[PDB]
Amino acid sequence: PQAKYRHDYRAPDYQITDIDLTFDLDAQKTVVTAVSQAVRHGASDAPLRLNGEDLKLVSVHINDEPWTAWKEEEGALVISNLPERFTLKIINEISPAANTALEGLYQSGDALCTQCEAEGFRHITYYLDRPDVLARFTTKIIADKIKYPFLLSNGNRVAQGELENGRHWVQWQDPFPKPCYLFALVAGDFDVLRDTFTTRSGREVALELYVDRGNLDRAPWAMTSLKNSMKWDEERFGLEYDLDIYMIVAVDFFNMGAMENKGLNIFNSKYVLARTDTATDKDYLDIERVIGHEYFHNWTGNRVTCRDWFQLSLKEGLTVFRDQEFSSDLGSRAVNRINNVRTMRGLQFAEDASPMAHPIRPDMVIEMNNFYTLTVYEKGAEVIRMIHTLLGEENFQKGMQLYFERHDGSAATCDDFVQAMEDASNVDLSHFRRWYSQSGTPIVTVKDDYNPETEQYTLTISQRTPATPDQAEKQPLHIPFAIELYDNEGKVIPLQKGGHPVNSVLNVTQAEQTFVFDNVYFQPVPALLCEFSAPVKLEYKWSDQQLTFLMRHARNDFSRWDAAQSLLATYIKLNVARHQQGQPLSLPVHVADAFRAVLLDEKIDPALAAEILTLPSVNEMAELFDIIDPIAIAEVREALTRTLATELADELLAIYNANYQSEYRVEHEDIAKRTLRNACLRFLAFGETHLADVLVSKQFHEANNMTDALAALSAAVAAQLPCRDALMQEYDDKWHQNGLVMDKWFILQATSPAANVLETVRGLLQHRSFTMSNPNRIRSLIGAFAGSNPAAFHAEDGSGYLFLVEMLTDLNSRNPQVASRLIEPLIRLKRYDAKRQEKMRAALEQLKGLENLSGDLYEKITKALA
Numbered sequence: 001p002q003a004k005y006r007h008d009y010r011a012p013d014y015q016i017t018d019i020d021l022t023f024d025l026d027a028q029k030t031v032v033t034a035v036s037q038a039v040r041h042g043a044s045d046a047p048l049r050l051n052g053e054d055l056k057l058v059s060v061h062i063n064d065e066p067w068t069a070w071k072e073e074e075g076a077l078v079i080s081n082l083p084e085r086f087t088l089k090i091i092n093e094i095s096p097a098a099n100t101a102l103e104g105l106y107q108s109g110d111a112l113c114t115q116c117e118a119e120g121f122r123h124i125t126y127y128l129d130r131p132d133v134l135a136r137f138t139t140k141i142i143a144d145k146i147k148y149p150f151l152l153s154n155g156n157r158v159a160q161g162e163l164e165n166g167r168h169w170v171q172w173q174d175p176f177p178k179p180c181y182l183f184a185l186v187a188g189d190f191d192v193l194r195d196t197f198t199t200r201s202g203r204e205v206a207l208e209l210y211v212d213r214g215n216l217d218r219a220p221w222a223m224t225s226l227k228n229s230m231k232w233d234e235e236r237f238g239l240e241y242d243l244d245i246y247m248i249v250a251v252d253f254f255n256m257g258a259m260e261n262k263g264l265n266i267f268n269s270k271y272v273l274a275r276t277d278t279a280t281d282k283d284y285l286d287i288e289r290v291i292g293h294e295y296f297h298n299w300t301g302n303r304v305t306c307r308d309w310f311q312l313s314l315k316e317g318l319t320v321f322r323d324q325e326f327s328s329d330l331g332s333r334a335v336n337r338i339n340n341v342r343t344m345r346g347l348q349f350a351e352d353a354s355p356m357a358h359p360i361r362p363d364m365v366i367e368m369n370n371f372y373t374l375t376v377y378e379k380g381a382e383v384i385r386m387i388h389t390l391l392g393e394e395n396f397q398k399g400m401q402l403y404f405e406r407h408d409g410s411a412a413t414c415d416d417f418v419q420a421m422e423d424a425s426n427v428d429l430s431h432f433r434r435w436y437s438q439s440g441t442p443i444v445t446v447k448d449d450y451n452p453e454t455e456q457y458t459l460t461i462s463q464r465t466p467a468t469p470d471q472a473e474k475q476p477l478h479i480p481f482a483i484e485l486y487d488n489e490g491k492v493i494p495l496q497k498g499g500h501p502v503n504s505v506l507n508v509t510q511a512e513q514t515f516v517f518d519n520v521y522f523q524p525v526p527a528l529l530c531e532f533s534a535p536v537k538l539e540y541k542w543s544d545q546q547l548t549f550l551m552r553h554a555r556n557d558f559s560r561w562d563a564a565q566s567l568l569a570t571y572i573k574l575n576v577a578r579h580q581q582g583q584p585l586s587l588p589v590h591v592a593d594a595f596r597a598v599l600l601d602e603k604i605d606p607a608l609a610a611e612i613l614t615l616p617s618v619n620e621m622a623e624l625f626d627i628i629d630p631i632a633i634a635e636v637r638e639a640l641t642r643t644l645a646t647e648l649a650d651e652l653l654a655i656y657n658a659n660y661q662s663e664y665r666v667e668h669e670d671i672a673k674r675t676l677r678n679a680c681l682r683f684l685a686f687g688e689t690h691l692a693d694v695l696v697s698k699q700f701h702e703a704n705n706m707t708d709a710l711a712a713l714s715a716a717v718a719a720q721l722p723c724r725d726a727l728m729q730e731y732d733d734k735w736h737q738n739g740l741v742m743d744k745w746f747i748l749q750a751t752s753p754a755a756n757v758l759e760t761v762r763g764l765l766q767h768r769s770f771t772m773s774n775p776n777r778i779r780s781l782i783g784a785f786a787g788s789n790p791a792a793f794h795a796e797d798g799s800g801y802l803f804l805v806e807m808l809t810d811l812n813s814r815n816p817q818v819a820s821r822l823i824e825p826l827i828r829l830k831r832y833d834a835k836r837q838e839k840m841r842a843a844l845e846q847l848k849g850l851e852n853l854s855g856d857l858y859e860k861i862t863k864a865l866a
């Protein structure tokens with residue numbers, strides 16, 4: 001298919017205002033009858049062009065007249081010579097059982113369910129499958145009662161009946177006009193957890209969580225999180241739910257985390273099912289954030305939707321911002337910010353440095369499913385957060401209110417959102433808008449000067465964004481650049497100039513500019529880009545002592561973690577260079593000293609300590625380098641772990657023991673202590689072998705929760721401890737029947753430092769708990785290997801690339817969306833040495849020649865080979 005361009009947007013020639021659907025459901029052959037009320041808006045001679053994929057057309061009527069003026073073409077049904085207003089009736093067949101791509105109506109175990117975003121509804125019937133067409137849906141579902149006792153679609157049950165031959169039916173009406181990507185249908189046999197939330201104005205909402213039979217023991221936390229999400233959106237954003245019923249269905253087979261279908265969200269079971277023996281603290285907090293995310297889409301996505309798919313970030317950047325604010329308000333703001341900055345620097349910057357680079361509002365798309373990206377989501381949220389930084393909470397909320405006032409019940413654009421924020425706040429965002437249009441990561445360079453004669457501190461700040469493959473032209477951005485200045489006692493120095501206070505958020509809008517601060521009585525230590533105030537790379541020539549000073553004194557916990565990152569970066573870079581010359585780790589004494597001080601500091605929040613004591617991942621480390629040496633990075637990461645383990649052995653054990661908790665609670669203070677304890681465990685695993693082996697095996701066996709059990713198992717694998725094989729087998733024996741739990745074990749197998757990792761991974765394709773039919777299994781074994789074990793994936797013999805090619809050859813046909821997620825590591829080839837590039841190019845060329853190459857892979861392969 002050809003690329004589509006944002007600049008080609010044109011209003012639809014026809015709208016559909018109302019659609020009545022009937023599904024005669026069966027896994028082999030489903031018959032869809034769709035009755036649409038259409039209204040022409042364009043030229044009177046314009047044909048109606050309906051999108052359709054893999055449909056068997058049965059009939060076409062206009063006002064009940066069999067229509068002869070139509071033609072089917074690739075991906076379309078084109079209907080000519082129509083009245084201005086008419087009733088379209090389409091009957092067509094589809095085959096859910098044959099739908100391995102999991103796009104449209106498909107089978108998940110014994111259940112039938114849908115996924116329609118972005119363009120899945122056209123796999124169900126011929127329709128105006130574009131998000132600026134908003135219709136009122138009524139959905140009648142007819143099915144075998146024994147096999148499908150629950151028949152669900154969006155909105156409220158308005159009719160129901162029984163039929164001969166053991167069939168029954170239910171009809172649903174959703175009063176809110178919607179784009180078809182928000183359509184959902186679910187049929188199957190479920191256990192149901194039912195509860196209620198009463199809104200602040202008194203609306204009683206029925207909450208219903210549908211899970212596979214036997215999974216009720218894993219449902220209450222998700223339900224609790226839904227209620228928490230509802231309450232928070234009221235308190236923080238002043239938003240209430242707008243329907244009578246809120247349904248969530250947890251399904252096993254799903255190509256995303258979850259989906260905000262109006263009143264009938266469909267979730268990957270990973271983001272619903274939890275009990276303390278199956279789920280970790282991280283699972284609990286992820287369920288919380290994804291339940292929140294889907295709930296928050298009700299306003300930011302559904303009540304206001306997207307005019308076209310290039311505006312995806314309008315809902316995704318804003319909804320991610322909302323889920324981050326939810327998690328941050330309920331939990332540790334510092335830990336959430338830290339985690340989101342690790343994702344930005346370690347994963348999103350890599351995308352912005354890749355052949356797939358795009359602005360948060362893309363200009364060119366071949367396959368829209370390829371644009372559900374770290375950029376659109378996470379950088380999108382950073383852009384929303386910059387607006388929040390520039391406006392402050394009160395004006396930001398005024399902007400939110402104006403946005404909803406203007407655009408409720410419509411399909412809007414990124415520009416509409418920015419305009420609402422500007423108009424509500426009187427803050428000029430004209431230059432700021434360039435963040436929507438420009439790809440790549442800006443680099444902000446800071447030079448400073450303290451003048452004792454004048455008691456002035458001057459920051460000379462410059463910016464540039466390197467060219468990206470998609471954009472030869474780059475321009476300066478409006479960068480909110482937050483600072484704080486500290487005296488030698490760690491006290492904040494008031495920012496001022498010429499007898500007036502200066503805002504700590506500097507407006508870095510030029511290629512080069514200077515900022516002068518007076519009444520700086522003594523030489524300051526600066527904290528720069530506070531709370532990661534803009535998604536940029538910072539270049540400032542820190543001394544080690546400035547950084548350790550900030551670790552001790554910075555007022556925001558984020559700054560203390562960030563200073564530790566800058567300190568480590570220097571020595572990670574040093575030691576990778578040493579590795580390449582066959583030299584062992586070298587680290588100045590004062591560095592281990594800084595981490596010792598973190599361990600022994602009584603005043604530090606355990607939440608913060610735990611994150612400082614969590615070394616950057618191999619993907620985070622890769623972004624420190626122009627050319628990635630993934631073997632050096634992996635070995636340096638282990639060497640650094642071992643060195644700190646040795647130098648801090650006593651302190652690590654003291655803190656490990658001090659943070660023991662006999663009670664298991666999913667509560668933030670407890671989670672912090674446990675995260676610290678297990679951060680210590682990572683290092684303790686690299687102590688004297690017998691001592692480490694005993695400690696690790698003890699934790700695995702004595703654990704009263706999965707967080708602690710998994711931490712121990714992970715350490716046994718990381719440090720290749722004697723107990724590893726026993727613990728791994730014990731886990732398999734206990735948990736093989738549980739796919740979500742086995743995913744953690746597949747991840748450990750895939751990311752193992754063992755020399756035989758690829759052999760093991762290949763063997764696990766035959767494991768009883770693995771299947772190529774399940775996206776979660778694929779991601780946990782194959783994705784984890786390719787993406788989270790770059791040292792093995794990039795083995796010099798090219799074996800990792802060949803393995804991935806085999807897997808992608810299958811998945812290109814089976815499930816292109818999952819295939820396209822999995823190909824990402826191969827498209828980073830230009831970051832690697834020449835020998836690696838050659839092998840990766842050969843792999844990509846093999847894939848390029850596949851019979852029936854998917855558009856999903858074609859788009860990425862083309863860019864990677866350019």
Ligand SMILES: C[C@H](N)P(=O)(O)C[C@@H](Cc1ccccc1)C(=O)N[C@@H](Cc1ccccc1)C(=O)O
Pocket residue numbers: 117255256257258259260289290293294316323372373377
């Ligand atoms: C496509 C839906 N409209 P969604 O709700 O945005 C899906 C989203 C749910 C989620 C939110 C927050 C954390 C984790 C999951 C989702 O799956 N996003 C993924 C990325 C993604 C994967 C596959 C398809 C689409 C997006 C992510 O942010 O990690």
Ligand SMILES: [Zn+2]
Pocket residue numbers: 293297315316319
């Ligand atoms: Zn979303």
